[PDB]
Amino acid sequence: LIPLVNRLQDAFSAIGQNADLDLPQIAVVGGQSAGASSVLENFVGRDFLPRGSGIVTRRPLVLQLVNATTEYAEFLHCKGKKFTDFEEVRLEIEAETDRVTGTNKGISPVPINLRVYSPHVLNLTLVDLPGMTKVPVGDQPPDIEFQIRDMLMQFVTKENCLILAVSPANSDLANSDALKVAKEVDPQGQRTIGVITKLDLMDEGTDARDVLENKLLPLRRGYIGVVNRSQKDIDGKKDITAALAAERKFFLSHPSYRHLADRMGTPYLQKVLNQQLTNHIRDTLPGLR
Amino acid sequence: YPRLREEMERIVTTHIREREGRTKEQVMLLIDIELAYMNTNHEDFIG
Numbered sequence A: 001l002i003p004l005v006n007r008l009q010d011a012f013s014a015i016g017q018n019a020d021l022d023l024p025q026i027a028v029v030g031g032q033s034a035g036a037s038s039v040l041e042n043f044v045g046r047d048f049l050p051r052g053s054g055i056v057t058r059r060p061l062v063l064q065l066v067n068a069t070t071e072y073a074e075f076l077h078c079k080g081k082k083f084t085d086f087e088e089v090r091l092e093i094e095a096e097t098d099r100v101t102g103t104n105k106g107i108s109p110v111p112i113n114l115r116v117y118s119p120h121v122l123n124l125t126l127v128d129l130p131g132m133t134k135v136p137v138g139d140q141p142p143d144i145e146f147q148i149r150d151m152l153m154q155f156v157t158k159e160n161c162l163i164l165a166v167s168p169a170n171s172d173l174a175n176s177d178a179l180k181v182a183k184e185v186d187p188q189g190q191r192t193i194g195v196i197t198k199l200d201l202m203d204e205g206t207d208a209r210d211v212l213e214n215k216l217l218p219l220r221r222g223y224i225g226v227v228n229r230s231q232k233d234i235d236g237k238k239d240i241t242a243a244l245a246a247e248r249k250f251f252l253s254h255p256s257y258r259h260l261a262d263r264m265g266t267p268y269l270q271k272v273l274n275q276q277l278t279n280h281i282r283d284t285l286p287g288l289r
Numbered sequence B: 001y002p003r004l005r006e007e008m009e010r011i012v013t014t015h016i017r018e019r020e021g022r023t024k025e026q027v028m029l030l031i032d033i034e035l036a037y038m039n040t041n042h043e044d045f046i047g
């Protein structure tokens, strides 16, 4: 079923003018290879982002959804071309990245603007940022760490902006740069939500049960655990439906997560973000009405 | 108490919003009343 706040965007689309909801911007932040771009991919529901091991995200991708009757994408460059095949979108993203950054692992602050039209996508804006690193590699100047942080500090330091802190499960939580940034810009935990991405790669004999129960490093809004497609599966062209079925099997099966099964997965993350967004319009509805 | 501060501020601001919708009607209606009739009986050259 369609949640009410989506039904509103459908209605305002039917009206066609002079009305729209005011929603926050969503930013995803994490360390390199954490799995952030597989989180945006899962959330949107279309496999159009470049993904894989190593530096991939070299530029800020400002994905802007729009509600419409037909599914397609477009860029603010290559004006007028309507992309109905998202593989072309993915290749265009890679080509646009290379045209500016170069091929020797360069990083640039100039954002890439993409707009996606689809039936039930409210007007949510999503931002993808290029990870975080400590040691320069390739044709990267020594001070790349500060430039990447400075890129982050232009999005997560604004209000009206949710933050997803993405952190791998097979790396002790104390090392996460996502939480460090979220804690620095959102000390009270008001906007931050935590995502734990690689629960299937835990070294045999360990788990993240202590982190999923919000005990080890208490965060106001809790932690949500997800399992995405491995490198082989993405190279094997596995469909999202199979990935979701696998995620459900994993959480339902793992002995340490059976009692948390109903709070874990991508769909639950969707519910949490729908409730979060629904609660940012409550005091504005009287004006719309 | 983050939950209680959040709710309390949401409620008091939603109320202030529902009242802006009533405060602005009487300002429009007072200007309309100013346009309905021309009263030259006081504090004017003729009066």
Ligand SMILES: Nc1nc2c(ncn2[C@@H]2O[C@H](COP(=O)(O)OP(=O)(O)O)[C@@H](O)[C@H]2O)c(=O)[nH]1
Pocket (backbone or CB within 6 Å): A030, A031, A032, A033, A034, A035, A036, A037, A038, A039, A051, A052, A053, A054, A056, A057, A131, A197, A198, A199, A200, A201, A226, A227, A228, A229, A230, A231, A232, A234
């Ligand atoms: N097995 C497994 N691999 C994952 C999971 N999440 C992410 N990965 C791997 O992480 C790799 C890189 O993730 P990526 O999306 O690039 O994170 P980014 O570097 O922030 O873009 C992908 O190739 C995935 O195969 C997971 O839940 N399980």
Ligand SMILES: [Mg+2]
Pocket (backbone or CB within 6 Å): A036, A037, A056, A057, A129, A130, A131
């Ligand atoms: Mg990335």
